[PDB]
Each structure stands twice: as C-alpha cells, then as structure tokens.
Write a protein that binds this ligand. Structure first.
Ligand SMILES: O=C1c2c(O)ccc(O)c2C(=O)c2c(O)ccc(O)c21
Length: 272
C-alpha cells in the first residue's frame, strides 16, 4: 500500500531517522516520509486499538487532531525492520537553526512572535497529554509564507505525567540543572527551562550554556543588546530551582510577551 500511494523524492535529512520529500498521489499534498528502524527504537507504546508501536507515533496521534503548531502525522506503516511515518510538508519551509544561522540574532518583535507560537504549540501538546522533551531551534520549522511555526521531532517525547522523570533523551545543552545534578526532573518545569534556552538563542544568535558547569551555575551573560524585559523573562525561565520558574500562563502574561504580531504580519514584515 505504501509505495503505491505516495511518490518518493529527495532525501531531506537524518538521523531521529531518514526523511524523504514525498507527494501524495490521491492529490499532490507535499508530505514528508520518515523511516525509523525498529532496532534503534528504545521506547514503545500502544494505540487505542492496542497495537505495539513506537512512542513517537503514539505521541503524534495524540497531538495531530485538529490544527495547531505541530506538524501532523497523516499516516504510518509498519515494515519488517522499520516503521514509516507520513507527515505534513509545508512549502517553503526552513528550520529555526538554519534561519538563525543565516540572519543572526532576531529582532525582538520577530522573536516575540516566534516564541509565542512555540508557547501555543507546547500548550497544545501538554493538553493532549504529550511532553516533547527536545524543544530546540532545529525542532521548529518555519512556514516562510504564512509565518507559522511548527514543532517536529517527537522521538524523545513522553506521555505527560506529574511524576518525576528519570530518563532523558534530548539535547544536553538544553537540559535543566536538576537533570545534570540529580538525574531527575518534572515535565512542565523542564520544558520551561528549555524554552528559556530557546528564547536566549533567538535573541542572541547562540545558546547561553555549553558545559555542565555553566548550566548548573545558571548565570546568563548576554552577548547581544536585549531589552531589560526580555532578559528578565529569560532569567526567570532559567531559574535554578524548578519551582521558581514561570508557568506557561505567567510567561504568556509577561510584559515582553504583550502585543504579539499575528503570523501573517510577521511574515510580511520579516519574511517577505
Ligand atoms: O526533518 C523533519 C521534517 C522535514 O525536514 C521537513 C518537513 C517535515 O514535515 C518534517 C517532520 O515532520 C519531522 C518530524 O516529525 C520528526 C523529525 C524530523 O527530523 C522531521
């Protein structure tokens, strides 16, 4: 059913897997086709109907209902040594790591719009019972035309829970001090930490911390001019003590978050 119903094109990256550009035949929706090999999956789950699948798929199904800032799972298949996922492919697109790498640090107005959309997308996941655990520039795609950000790689994700996590598969330089020191964290507050790393990156062109010692020390130096309110929000997300970090609500009610542009205006002003 698979090679009949879609048409493969160029590789796009790897790997989280190996992803090819693809076209649905039924109608020419761009799609992306991700192959994941059974032998590299450390982490499995089960769907409603009760089949044994990779967590990624569990997590993607939970979040793919309706619209949002997540790239949606349109379908999937099993093969003898691999699973294969069919995902949306917006067109044209660029990931935030490449975008930042090309244009350097981002004007506050642009960072505010982007950051807001990441916030909405993460709220959506938490809502659906999903925690991403690897929120970073390269897991965000920009739809250059509509100005809409989309989250992508759920392969380190987990079901959201209130219990304390003991495993972590995401990026180190994005991991919170509680993980570095004690090998334990909670979802929401670890996510806020990483959101804080992300926001620094947006406005400074680079991440704040490289080594464990700098993460655990939690002192943030700004290498770029950044308003006083943005520094405050960033420092707040990057508090050492989990309980001293903001909730999403508080981040979203922060002064620096006010009067966010809509996506379309963001694209006009900053992407056209
Ligand atoms: O690299 C992608 C990806 C992509 O490169 C282009 C369009 C896309 O739609 C995705 C995508 O949905 C995607 C994903 O869900 C997980 C890991 C990934 O590396 C990716």
């Amino acid at each position: 059913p698979l090679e009949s119903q879609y048409q493969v094109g160029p590789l796009l990256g790897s790997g989280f897997g190996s992803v090819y550009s693809g076209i649905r035949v039924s109608d020419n929706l761009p799609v992306a086709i991700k192959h994941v090999e059974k032998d590299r999956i450390s982490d499995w789950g089960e769907l409603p109907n009760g089949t044994r699948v990779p967590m990624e798929v569990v997590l993607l199904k939970k979040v793919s209902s309706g619209f949002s800032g997540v790239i949606r799972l349109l379908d999937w298949f099993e093969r003898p040594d691999s699973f294969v996922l069919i995902l949306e492919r917006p067109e044209p697109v660029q990931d935030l790591f490449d975008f930042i790498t090309e244009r350097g640090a981002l004007q506050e107005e642009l960072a505010r719009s982007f950051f807001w959309q990441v916030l909405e997308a993460v709220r959506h996941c938490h809502n659906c019972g999903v925690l991403h655990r690897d929120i970073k520039d390269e897991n965000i795609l920009i739809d250059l035309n509509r100005g809409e950000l989309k989250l992508i790689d759920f392969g380190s994700g987990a079901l959201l829970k209130d219990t304390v996590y003991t495993d972590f598969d995401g990026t180190r330089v994005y991991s919170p001090p509680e993980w570095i020191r004690y090998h334990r964290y909670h979802g929401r507050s670890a996510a806020v930490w990483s959101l804080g790393i992300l926001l620094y990156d947006m406005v400074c062109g680079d991440i704040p911390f490289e080594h464990d010692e700098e993460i655990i020390r939690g002192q943030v130096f700004f290498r770029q001019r950044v308003s006083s309110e943005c520094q405050h929000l960033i420092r707040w997300c990057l508090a050492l003590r989990p309980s001293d970090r903001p909730t999403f609500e508080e981040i979203q009610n922060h002064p620096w978050m006010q009067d966010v542009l809509l996506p379309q205006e963001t694209a006009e002003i900053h992407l056209h």
